[PDB]
RNA sequence: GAGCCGAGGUUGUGAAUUGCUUUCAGAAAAGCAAUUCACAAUAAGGAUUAUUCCGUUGUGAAAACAUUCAAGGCGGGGCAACUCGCCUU
DNA sequence: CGTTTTGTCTCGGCGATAATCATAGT
DNA sequence: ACTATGATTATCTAATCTACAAAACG
């Protein structure tokens, strides 16, 4: 008689909501409220989530964190090297004196940038190793190239020299730190692949293409021939790009069973493919029979202009660097007696690991080579453990009491699917579920071949010894054949058959020289634990060797068989090991079944059920189903449900009765909600704000009372996954406890479909109200474009109709330009009653009389439905007209940071490693402080710099986009002159002049374009810009880094006021906000230098009201009489810069036509947002703007 | 969702070579650079000495948190710290 | 001032299937 | 001798703008 319905139009970043209360029997009803809540998301995410490309803020934050973590790990390696070398007395005096060895161990002292080789004496820098540089000079002159080379090329000369000769200890420290910089490519798993692993990179020329007579797709395929005698494996069709073309290949070879090389082919081109580049560099290094450092040194000797870093050696295997460093260290150990000193080694080991005695005792047996190479520099951490994220068992729970005097439950981790207990349980399940059917008549031929316990025991034994069962093997075990019988499932599908024991038996038979009885249950599970738990190469090898030593087995072929065992797939079952251990005695039948192996609880329950007594834990359905279990002997080969109830006492997942009687339950559920509980963060964010909106509606319109929402309709109109989880969550509100409403989702949740929505919109005229609601925008567009092509006349409706020209018909749709369409969708979903959706989903009647009553009740005499009440369209249109869209504001600028770090804490006279919280106050910046690109400050005497601005320059690649205007912005004038000369030579055509071949030609003959004077090659140039860029920081060289504010970081636009009436405008930078908020002050300075008082500041996604020109709003207040014209004048802050504050009307979501530089037209001009009102008055908003406050429901918070 | 790593790029310091402009006076210096090398920083900053980290996630007024969390015993694993399991509150 | 035009850090591995080559039972 | 099944690599795994901040221009 009176019923409350709420509708939610969930979107990708929007939440449209509505609430209706209708009396259907009297054709009465009304809309309590409507609105649209918007979470600010850019169109990039909305266009990327459909395909998927790193669509997550958390993903970008994680990428930044990973880069940082690599940086601090490199820095920590450098600090440890500094400490060790200072103990060894290897650092130079000037470099060591600027390193802190007492408070911040190994770190540079503040405001210092020392260099290991550049000694700063009384203002002049001198190279530390003059003798080595001189030796390199005679080396170069013997190569006959030049005598003027950089000092810092000595690193490679020393790297080559250190292989076989003595070098100075400071040079050795330089080498060690340089090795710490560049480490190489390495795969942590290792697991050396096939012994051949050819993967050779070659260059071959095609000789002949002989037709092979294979016609496919109306063309006879051909093959390829090479000079060495190799045939390209695949067929070739296009002969134009294959005749005598020198393609490069990564050819792979492998020795097969027959004993010949199966040579594949992989067409690849260098300098664009990582694999080809790496393989070519590695082959060049290896065929020279020299280390990477020696190869680099000789290459640089041959071509002094060669780019080393990033051109010559980009990415090579870490083994090359490790071999070079090992050779250097073993050679230098023979000369430097510090590296052979045990006392110095003990001092180093104590300094590094003073509180870790075990690691000290471990490293006491090694030497400095292992410390520098294996321990410090090339130490790579293993993958972080993820066993804490494993899903928990749903049945077996452990309860305990903590120190807080409470009692919570500790969950049990799920058993791995490959655990032999899980394998046995799954095999028993598959045997129980297995039955046979005949091909002839499709009759239940089973129960004759599998009737007694002997048959099932034989089948279990047969399946135990195999790894995968199929049609033919299972048929042959029963002597049946494919031509006469089938096994009730997919004929060409195979099932797991306890493969683990199969491989275990195979590898325990491969070792031989043992009896065929060593494989038992305990030994099998021990080998399982050894292989699975110990996931590390050397650890696994040592574990296997020690296991073979403990048990009387030969450790010769057992280790060899088990050393290359394939890793297990990461998977876990639904239950835990305890659950399967308890269920298996029930599963087992025959000789594997015994009553003594069933635990006390299940045995007692079985005794009770067979006795027939009355117990509270036994349901009537149990006696209905377990009636056949009269004797305890019948409890053999029971199914999963039976055994589950016997062990526990629950008929499968029985769910709970989650009913919430007040908004406080919803509030605490919000408090207890967990992050990353769904598919992606987008949906969890949307639902978080969704139920928050639901809580706000509940509080506002029902005071949080019980059973306020009689029904909730959720429809959306990829995104299907969020059509049911939300229904389940909100079933806690719309559930009925009388027993007639049962299930995971309450019957009060009725999601719909698009057909009903469209039909009711057309019949009730929601399309009409939307059209004449959006028409004024199109009339304005016609007036702006002084044409009549944005509105189409029709005579039946005697009015205009919004439309777009075909040339602007790319992706325009009328239902996506205004944010109120979310509210419209929510309203149409909410009002779709059960009768309406039933009628429009089951229109197929099979008889006109059966559905004629619904025709009489709902539609007017299939033409038109009755409106829900007399004025449904009218008041629906009014409610759309009086909606203030609520926009979420993200004003998080700083936040409190919590850091927990492991540490040795002195406890009870002993040092034990534990976790400690960081002391003091540490702030976290929640916004991107600046853009990635970094520019330097320069001053140009030929550029007039106005006061308040600076010149910043950065390096750019020289390309075809360098015209006269672009050339004029280069900081240097020599390059400007040269480029102007070259461009004049090429008839003023940047495309021809600055093409890569054109750039190469310019660099070849740069003398002719420089008035005959030599110049270095030009590939990149520095271009300046006259603007306002701020410094990154204040310490070290961070002062010299000038950056630009990141996207969406101008959060504040302050308008300052004098006593006269004049307004002044200024946008607050982010760093000032940081300082003011961390000092506890207000975000915006309430005072300028001139002394003007602050009126207010504007922030993005904030709503302001612009009064009419005649109105004078100073202390009007009265924010209840917001009729249509008032909301029509509400504007939203979009972006700000300098003295400009751009606005878009709050209703507007997407533009009718975005501005394009070609047509030079747009709805809101070039910026797609105006500093003035859209109407004809065209008045500056900031001159008379007054701020309004909106809650989540869009009400005015006066 | 997260973890283990890698290669460049950018700004700055230092250096070798070569340019444009200016001031001294073809010498010297400065501003702006180009090719190559070493190094520093790589979001401002804050702890720590563990082979540990927190800083572009989200919540909300507490400038508080979630994103980490017990006790014991019965075990596997290594040179072992540590890690992987079982058992009861 | 009002308005439009231009620039913005980028690349690798730790992947999936599809297709041909073998390869024993039949 | 024919068939179906077990396995290595080749091929692909997409195809990307958006919109703010501000210098440049009229």
Are A67 and A47 within one domain? no
Cited resolution, angstroms:
2.6
Could you tell me where the beta strands, DSSP code E, fall in A205-260? Answer: 211-215, 220-222, 247-251
Cα separation, A506 vs A523, whole angstroms: 14
- Burial label, A84 (beta-carbon count in 10 A; 0-12, 13-18, 19+): buried
Calpha distance A734→A828 (Å, rounded): 20
Q: How far is the CA of A312 from the C1' of B18 (A)?
A: 24
Are A1070 and A1039 in the same domain?
no
A755 plus A705 within the same structural domain: yes
Where residue A786 falls (left for φ over 0; alpha for ψ -120 to 50; beta otherwise) is left
Under 8 Å between Cβ of A997 and A913:
no
| Strand, coil or helix: A5 | strand
Tokens at residue A1073, please? Answer: 């906000």
- Those residues with Cβ within 8 angstroms of residue A437's Cβ, 6 or more apart along the chain or in another chain: A443, A444, A445, A446, A485, A486, A487, A488
In strand C, which positions have an atom below 7 A from any protein CB? 1-9, 12-14, 20-24, 26
- Whether A816 and A674 map to the same domain: the answer is yes
| Residue A786 and residue A863 in one domain | yes
What dihedral angle (degrees, nearest 10) is formed by the CA atoms of A579, A582, A583, A587? 150
> What crossing angle do the helices spanning A154-161 and A292-302 adopt, rounded to 10°?
130
Distance (Å, whole) CA A949 – CA A957: 26
Is A894:A924 a contact under the CB 8 Å cutoff? Answer: yes
Round and report the angstrom distance from CA (A942) to C1' (B20): 12
Answer yes or no: is A406 within a domain: no
Same domain flag for A476 and A520: yes
Helix, strand or coil, per DSSP, at residue A948: coil
Residues 459-478 of A with CB under 7 A from strand D: 470
User: What contacts A378, CB < 8 A, 6 or more positions away?
Assistant: A183, A318, A321, A322, A325
SS3 A278: helix
Q: Does residue A1147 lie in a domain region? A: yes
Spatial contact of A234 and A242, defined as CB atoms under 8 Å apart: no
DSSP string, A1055-1079: EEE-SSS-EEEEEE-HHHHHHHHHT
DSSP string, A489-508: S-TT--EE--HHHHHHHHHH
* A968 CB-to-strand D distance under 7 Å: no
Which residues from the 184-243 window of protein chain A have CB within 7 angstroms of nucleic acid chain D? 194, 233-234
Distance CA A788, CA A804 (A): 10
Token pair, residue A1088, equals 């300028």
- Tell me the CA–C1' distance in angstroms for A299 and C8: 38
CB crowding A373-395: b at 16 or more within 10 Å, else e: bebbbbeeeeeeeeeeeeeebeb
A945 and A1094 housed in the same domain: no
Sign (positive/negative) of CA torsion A846, A848, A852, A858? positive
Which tokens hold the place of A467? 């790894």
* Triad A439, A441, A447: Cα angle to 5°: 80
- DSSP 8-state code for residue A596: G
- What is the token pair recorded at A1129? 């004048």
On whether the CB atoms of residues A669 and A624 are closer than 8 A, the answer is: no
Distance, in Å, from the CA atom of A69 to the CA atom of A304, rounded to the nearest integer, reads 36
Distance, in Å, from the CA atom of A267 to the CA atom of A245, rounded to the nearest integer, reads 12
DSSP character string of A124-169 = EEEES-HHHHHHHHHHHHHHTS-S---GGGHHHHHHHHTTTS---H
Of A647, A676, A701, the one marking the end of a domain is A647
The encoded tokens of residue A517 equal 């009885």
The nucleotide closest to A275 (CA, C1' atoms) = C12
User: A109, A99 in Cβ contact below 8 A?
Assistant: yes
In a domain, A1118, yes or no: yes
Query: Residue A628's CB: how many other CB atoms inside 10 A?
Result: 7
A601 burial level (CB within 10 Å; 0-12, 13-18, 19+): middle
A509: CB partners within 8 A, 6+ apart: A516
Q: Residue A1171 is encoded by which pair of tokens? A: 């500093």
How far is A284 from A1049, CA to CA, in rounded Å?
49
Check if the beta carbon of residue A625 is closer than 8 Å to that of residue A638: no
Encode A1039-1064: b = buried (16+ Cβ within 10 Å), e = exposed: eebbbbbeeebbbbbbbbeeeeeeee
Per the entry, the structure determination technique was cryo-EM
CA distance A325 to A884: 69
Q: Where are the beta strands (DSSP E) in A472-590?
A: 485-486, 495-496
- What are residue A319's phi and psi, to 5 degrees? -60, -30
Residue A898 falls inside a structural domain: no
- The neighbouring-strand residues paired with A818 are A1148
Cα gap A331→A507, rounded to integer Å = 43
**C-alpha distance from residue A873 to each of A649, A827, A854, A869, A882 (Å):** 56, 12, 22, 9, 14
Q: How far apart are CA A799 and CA A801, in angstroms?
A: 7
> Is any atom of nucleic acid chain D found less than 7 Å from the CB of residue A875?
no
Following CA atoms A629, A631, A637, A639 in sequence, which dihedral angle do they give, to the nearest 10 degrees? Answer: 20
d(CA A346, CA A338): 12
Residue A644 to residues A81, A579, A604, A626, A641: CA-CA distances in angstroms? 59, 9, 15, 13, 5
User: What whole-number distance in Å separates Cα of residue A234 and Cα of residue A236?
Assistant: 7
| A176, A91 Cβ separation under 8 angstroms | no
| Residue A158 belongs to some domain of the structure | yes
- Rounded alpha-carbon distances, angstroms, from residue A517 to A504, A521, A524, A550: 13, 11, 12, 17
The answer to whether position A391 is within a domain reads: no
For residues A761 and A876, the answer to whether their CB atoms sit within 8 Å is no
| Closest C-alpha to A1194, from A1147, A1150, A1134 | A1147
Q: Give CA angle at A190 (A187, A195), nearest 5°.
A: 120
Provide the domain limits for residue A1145: 1052-1187
Report the alpha-carbon distance of residue A446 to residue A455 in Å, rounded. Answer: 11
Closest nucleotide (C1' vs CA) to A1178 is: C2
Same domain, A522 and A605: yes
**Domain final residue, candidates A990, A1018, A1043:** A1043
Looking at chain A, how many residues does it have? 1198
Q: Are residues A732 and A879 in the same domain?
A: yes
Q: What is the sign of the dihedral through the CA atoms of A1115, A1119, A1122 and A1126?
A: positive
Report the alpha-carbon distance of residue A371 to residue A360 in Å, rounded: 11
What is the spatial distance between Cα A771 and Cα A782, in angstroms, rounded to a whole number?
16
Q: What's the start-to-end Cα distance of chain A, in Å?
A: 37
In this structure, are A596 and A673 located in the same domain?
no
Cβ distance A1100 to A1115 under 8 Å? Answer: no
Q: How many Å from the CA of A1000 to C1' of B16?
A: 24
Cα–Cα distance for residue pair A365/A373, rounded to 1 Å: 15
Whether residues A49 and A66 share a domain: the answer is no
Among chain A residues 1006-1045, those with CB within 7 Å of any atom of strand D: 1025-1029, 1044-1045
Taking CA A659 as the corner, what is the angle to CA A655 and CA A664, rounded to the nearest 5 degrees? 130
* Residue reference for tokens 């038996």: A505
> What is the Cα–Cα distance from A563 to A569, expressed in whole angstroms?
17
Considering the domain boundaries, does residue A1080 fall inside one? yes
Asked if residue A947 is part of any domain, the answer here is: yes
As a whole number of angstroms, the distance between CA A999 and CA A814 comes to 50
Number of domains in chain A: 6
Instruction: Tell me which DSSP letter residue A1160 carries.
Output: -
Q: Select from A214, A208, A256 the least CA-distant residue to A230.
A: A208
Query: What are phi and psi for residue A147, nearest 5 degrees?
Result: -130, 5
Claim to verify: residue A552 and residue A639 sit in the same structural domain: yes
Q: How far is the CA of A382 from the C1' of B75 (A)?
A: 24
- Domain boundary, last residue among A1024, A1043, A1062: A1043
User: Do the beta carbons of residue A815 and residue A770 sit within 8 Å?
Assistant: yes
Enumerate the H helices of A676-819 as residue ranges.
Answer: 681-702, 725-730, 754-764, 766-784
Tokens of A412: 């049990």
Q: Nearest nucleotide to A973 by CA–C1' distance?
A: B20
């Amino acid at each position: 008689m009176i019923k409350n319905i709420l509708g939610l139009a969930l979107g990708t970043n929007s939440i449209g909501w509505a609430l209706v209360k209708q009396d259907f029997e009297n054709k009465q009803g009304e809309i309590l409220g409507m609105g649209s809540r918007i979470i600010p998301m850019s169109q990039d995410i909305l266009g990327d989530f459909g395909k998927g490309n790193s669509v997550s803020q958390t993903a970008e934050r994680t990428k930044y964190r990973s880069v940082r973590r690599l940086r601090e790990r490199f820095l920590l390696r450098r600090e440890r090297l500094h400490r060790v070398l200072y103990i060894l007395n290897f650092l130079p005096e000037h470099y060591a004196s600027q390193i802190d060895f007492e408070k911040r161990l190994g770190k540079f002292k503040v405001e210092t940038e020392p260099k290991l080789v550049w000694k700063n004496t009384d203002g002049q820098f001198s190279f530390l190793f003059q003798n080595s540089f001189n030796e390199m000079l005679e080396d170069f002159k013997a190569a006959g190239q030049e005598l003027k080379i950089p000092y810092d090329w000595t690193i490679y000369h020393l790297r080559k020299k250190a292989i076989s000769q003595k070098i100075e200890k400071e040079e050795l420290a330089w080498i060690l730190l340089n090795f710490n910089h560049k480490r190489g490519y390495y795969q942590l798993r290792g697991e050396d692949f096939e012994e051949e692993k050819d993967k050779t990179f070659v260059r071959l020329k095609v000789d002949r293409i002989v037709d092979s007579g294979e016609n496919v797709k109306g063309k006879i395929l051909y093959d390829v021939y090479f000079e060495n005698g190799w045939k390209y494996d695949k067929q070739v069709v296009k002969t134009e790009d294959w005749v005598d073309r020198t393609k490069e290949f990564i050819v792979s070879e492998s020795i097969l069973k027959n004993g010949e090389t199966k040579r594949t082919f992989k067409a690849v081109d260098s300098e664009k493919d990582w694999i080809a580049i790496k393989t070519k560099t590695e082959q060049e290094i290896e065929h020279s029979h020299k280390t990477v450092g020696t190869y680099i040194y000789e290459t640089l000797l041959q071509n002094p202009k060669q780019k080393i870093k990033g051109k010559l050696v980009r990415t090579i295997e870490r083994k090359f660097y490790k071999e070079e460093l090992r050779q250097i260290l073993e050679k230098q150990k023979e000369f430097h007696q510090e590296l052979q000193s045990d006392d110095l080694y003990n001092d180093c080991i104590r300094e590094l690991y003073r509180n870790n005695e075990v690691h000290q005792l471990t490293l006491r047996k090694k030497d400095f080579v292992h410390l520098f190479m294996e321990d410090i520099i090339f130490y790579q951490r293993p993958l972080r453990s993820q066993k804490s994220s494993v899903s928990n068992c749903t049945l077996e729970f452990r309860k305990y009491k903590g120190e807080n005097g409470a009692e919570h439950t500790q969950y049990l981790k799920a058993i791995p699917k490959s655990n032999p207990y899980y394998q046995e349980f799954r095999l028993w399940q598959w045997i129980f579920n297995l039955n046979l059917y005949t091909k002839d008549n499709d009759e239940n031929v089973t129960k004759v071949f599998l009737n007694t316990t002997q048959d099932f025991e034989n089948l279990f034994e047969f399946l135990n010894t195999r790894k995968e069962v199929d049609q033919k093997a299972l048929l042959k075990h029963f002597k049946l054949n494919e031509k006469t019988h089938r096994w009730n499932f997919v004929e060409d599908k195979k099932y797991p058959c306890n493969e683990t024991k199969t491989m275990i038996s195979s590898r325990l038979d491969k070792v031989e020289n043992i009896s065929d009885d060593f494989l038992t249950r305990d030994i099998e599970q021990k080998i399982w634990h050894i292989i699975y738990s110990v996931n590390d190469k050397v650890e696994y090898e040592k574990a296997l060797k020690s296991f073979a030593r403990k048990h009387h087995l030969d450790e010769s072929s057992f280790f060899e068989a088990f050393r290359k065992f394939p890793p297990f797939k990461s998977e876990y079952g639904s239950f835990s090991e305890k659950a399967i251990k308890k269920l298996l005695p029930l599963m087992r039948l025959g000789k594997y079944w015994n009553y003594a192996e069933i635990d006390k609880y299940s045995r007692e329950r079985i005794q009770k059920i067979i006795t027939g007594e009355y117990d509270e834990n036994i349901k009537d359905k149990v006696r209905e189903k377990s009636v056949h279990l009269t004797i305890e002997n019948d409890f053999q080969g029971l199914q999963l449900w039976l055994a589950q109830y016997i062990v526990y006492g629950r008929h499968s997942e029985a769910s709970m009765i989650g009913k919430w009687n007040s908004a406080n339950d919803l509030e605490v559920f919000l408090k207890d909600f967990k992050q990353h509980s769904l598919r992606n963060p987008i949906v969890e964010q949307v639902i978080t704000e969704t139920l928050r909106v639901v809580k706000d509606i509940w509080l506002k319109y029902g005071n949080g009372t019980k059973d306020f929402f009689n029904e909730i309709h959720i429809e959306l109109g990829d995104t299907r996954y969020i059509s049911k989880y939300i229904s389940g969550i909100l079933s806690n509100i719309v559930r009925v406890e009388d027993g007639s409403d049962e299930g995971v989702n309450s019957k009060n949740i009725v999601p719909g479909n698009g057909k009903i929505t469209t039909q009711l919109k057309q019949d009730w005229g929601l399309n009409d109200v939307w059209n004449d609601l959006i028409l004024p925008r199109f009339e304005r567009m016609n007036q702006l474009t002084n044409s009549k092509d944005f509105t189409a006349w029709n005579e039946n409706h005697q009015k205009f109709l919004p439309t777009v020209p075909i040339e602007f018909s790319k992706g325009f749709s009328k239902k996506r330009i205004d944010h109120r369409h979310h509210a419209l969708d929510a309203l149409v979903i909410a009002c779709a009653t059960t009768d309406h959706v039933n009628l429009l989903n089951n229109q197929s009647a099979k008889s006109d009389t059966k559905r004629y009553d619904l025709k009489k009740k709902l539609m007017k005499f299939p033409k038109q439905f009755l409106k829900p009440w007399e004025k449904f369209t009218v008041d629906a249109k009014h409610n759309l007209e009086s909606i203030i869209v609520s926009f979420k504001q993200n004003l998080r600028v700083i936040n409190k940071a919590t850091n927990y770090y492991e540490k040795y804490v002195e406890k009870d006279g002993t040092k034990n490693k534990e976790r400690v919280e960081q002391a003091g106050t540490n702030w976290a910046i929640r916004k991107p402080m600046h853009k990635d690109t970094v520019s330097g400050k320069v001053d140009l005497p030929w550029v007039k710099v106005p006061k308040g601005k600076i010149l910043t320059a950065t390096r750019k690649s020289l390309d075809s986009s360098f015209d006269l205007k672009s050339i004029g912005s280069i900081t240097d004038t020599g390059i400007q002159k040269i480029l102007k000369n070259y461009l004049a030579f090429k008839d003023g055509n940047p495309e021809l002049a600055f093409s890569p071949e054109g750039i190469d030609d310019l660099n070849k003959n740069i003398e002719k374009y420089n008035d005959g004077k030599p110049h270095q090659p030009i590939n990149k140039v520095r271009v300046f810009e006259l603007g306002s860029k701020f410094q990154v920081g204040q310490t070290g060289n961070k002062k010299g880094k000038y950056v630009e504010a990141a996207k969406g970081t101008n959060l504040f636009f302050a308008v300052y006021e004098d006593e006269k009436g004049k307004r002044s405008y200024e946008t607050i930078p982010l760093n000032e906000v940081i300082e003011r908020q961390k000092q506890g002050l207000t975000s915006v300075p309430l005072e300028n230098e001139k002394g003007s008082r602050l009126l207010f500041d504007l922030s993005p996604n904030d709503l302001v009201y612009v009064p009419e020109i005649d109105e004078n709003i100073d202390s009007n207040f009265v924010f209840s009489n917001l009729n249509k014209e008032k909301i029509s004048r509400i504007y939203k802050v979009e972006k700000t810069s300098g003295t400009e504050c751009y606005f878009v009307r709050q209703d507007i979501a997407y533009l009718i036509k975005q501005y394009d530089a070609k047509t030079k037209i747009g709805e809101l001009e070039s910026q797609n947002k105006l500093q003035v009102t859209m109407t004809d008055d065209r008045i500056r908003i900031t001159d008379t703007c007054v701020k309004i406050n909106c809650d989540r429901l869009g009400n005015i918070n006066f």
